[PDB]
Design a protein around this ligand. Structure first.
Ligand SMILES: CSC[C@@H](O)[C@@H](O)C(=O)COP(=O)(O)O
Ligand SMILES: CSC[C@@H](O)[C@H](O)C(=O)COP(=O)(O)O
Lengths: 349, 349
């Protein structure tokens, strides 16, 4: 079962259905759903039955393609007109993760020159699938490129869950941990539980234990004391959107970790494929930050941890300025210097 | 009841019983338990049925005095000798907060000249009560001293629960919020839920609303995004033990809060009575950091939030270096630096 990370679990195309692992039922139960309509896909994304930027893009894509089937039309222009309506719909699920819009826009552009309806449908399916297989390679290369940053026995801190179920498989930020365990370098990782949704203790602690990876859980507030007491070597995280300048919007807490890392002068690393980059957003300040249902903070896995009417500020992401970032790892390699210049030279083709 | 903070709820002496608020049940329900044995006081402390440094001291003191009544002996020296076994037992309760040892030690000293066993016993009670009545007055001064630091309409962030039920009454870090409320000084409090025990979520958010204080709940990981997005103007926390150095031992998370505060150039304040200072240790490294059962982090109320056997690191406190401290508020007023020399002057009265 220590190989489960190398197999697709988050989302699978079934031609007539889209099967997704239900992440809200972990760590307790491992259940799979059958999404059949875009309402289902919209619901899975919005309520986090499926989460993690890359995997959300893939699902949204399979979602648009599955839904385009029942678009019984004569015209291709009309087909596009109808297709655009379903796209806007699934795109309004969650704001921050660029991958969502990026996937949808990719499938949209794949039928711009389409000549027939059937050719379009096929295009959508093929383009969706290609997106998934492509994500698999990048994750694989991201895992490789990043491990270069760690020496044997390093203690790495991380936040949220940027692993095998947040992507097609393998993962991004957690990917190098699966490889290091392959190359016997005794890496020790400290996973922040990631409140309020707890992606760290519920998914991260879950999948790494599954892979026979050494992982210790800690609350988020314990970061600082842990960097000191445990002398962690570095901090590696994924991302939901990287601005043209390096500003990375990621799970809420990341920004606090980056400022903490700098204080302890511990390198802070961000790993994410090109699909998560947004070259048209100038800086992090222009990145939409999603604020979710407040009961997220008032309750947990079922019952009360706060009075009912207490007002809460529930942002699901923050922004880490590129200057607190020691490096960003992508499928093409590791950037360090001037990110604006690096981001660009990176999108040569 | 807004004025509920101005009345003792944490611990109350009853000659043949000690009544406390069962803090485990908040905010769900408000329940008082009767403590009648040394084992009870010991249970309530270890299980956090009563918590917060001063309340722990006041409560421990009453237990010692209470258990001393069972001591059968005409020999005063045999009496004190026995008082010492009960004292060690009560003291090995929890290690980090000095108020426990301080109160227990203060009571032991009250009988060292005792000529009679009945005198000594009476002595212990009077001394216990006096510690309680004195904490109330110190809380008052501190709320009134820290209020000088805040202005109308400014946002303040705090952590854990250094208030009304963690002390005799009124509280410390939270004291000024109540005092500001009675004079209509518009203050917006931002409370960190404080994982894994959630004293901020279940206690602070509870007593502040119950006082008409404008409070907003956030997770511990939201602090960085909040200090910037809400333009936080300051941070005020309580304390479990301050070394002659000024190094403050407080609820896990304080340390990171102090460092996030320094980055954002936001003043950081520690509010705590003299009984919380420890001049016997020269710095934070000399302060015992209690590590609690890892279950507090893997689950809550029987609802697990992680794999049941994932390794955990559960420190309930961390150390904030005096350098990251803008000021320390005591019944004596405010200290802004050169702490050693300063608290040194402090204790010569
Ligand atoms: C492949 S994970 C990349 C990020 O999107 C992820 O780490 C994250 O920070 C938030 O994911 P979410 O969908 O918000 O739960
Ligand atoms: C008036 S309480 C101040 C402190 O003792 C501080 O708030 C704290 O950290 C609490 O410890 P706890 O573990 O809850 O007992």
């Amino acid at each position: 079962m220590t190989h489960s990370f190398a197999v697709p679990r988050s989302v699978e195309w079934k031609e007539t259905a889209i099967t997704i692992l239900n992440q809200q039922k972990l760590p307790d139960e491992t259940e799979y759903l059958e999404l059949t309509t875009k309402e289902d896909v919209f619901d899975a994304i919005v309520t986090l039955k499926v989460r993690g930027a890359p995997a959300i893009g893939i699902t949204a894509a399979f979602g648009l393609a599955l839904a385009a089937k029942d678009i019984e039309t004569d015209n291709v222009t009309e087909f596009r007109r109808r297709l655009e309506d379903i796209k806007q719909y699934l795109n309004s699920s969650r704001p921050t993760a660029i991958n969502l819009s990026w996937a949808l826009e990719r499938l949209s552009h794949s039928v711009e020159n389409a000549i027939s309806v059937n050719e379009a449908k096929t295009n959508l399916v093929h383009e969706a699938i290609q997106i998934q297989v492509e994500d698999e390679e990048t994750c694989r290369l991201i895992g490789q490129n990043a491990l270069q940053l760690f020496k044997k026995g390093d203690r790495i801190m991380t936040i949220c869950n940027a692993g095998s179920i947040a992507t097609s498989r393998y993962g991004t930020a957690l990917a190098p941990f699966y490889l290091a365990k392959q190359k016997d370098l005794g890496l020790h990782i400290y996973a922040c539980e990631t409140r309020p949704v707890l992606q760290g203790s519920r998914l991260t602690a879950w999948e790494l234990m599954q892979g026979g990876i050494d992982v210790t859980l800690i609350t988020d507030s314990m970061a600082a004391h842990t960097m000191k007491e445990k002398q962690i070597s570095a901090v590696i995280v994924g991302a939901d959107r990287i601005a043209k300048n390096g500003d990375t919007a990621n799970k809420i807490g990341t920004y606090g970790l980056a400022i903490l890392a700098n204080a302890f002068d511990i390198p802070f690393f961000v790993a994410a494929p090109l699909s998560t980059f947004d070259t048209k957003v100038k800086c992090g300040a222009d990145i939409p930050i999603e604020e979710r249902d407040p009961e997220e903070v008032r309750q947990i896995s079922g019952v009360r941890t706060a009075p009912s009417n207490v007002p809460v500020f529930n942002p699901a992401f923050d922004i880490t300025p590129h200057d607190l970032i020691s490096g960003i790892i992508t499928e093409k390699g590791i950037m360090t210097g001037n990110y604006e210049e690096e981001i660009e030279q990176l999108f040569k083709g």
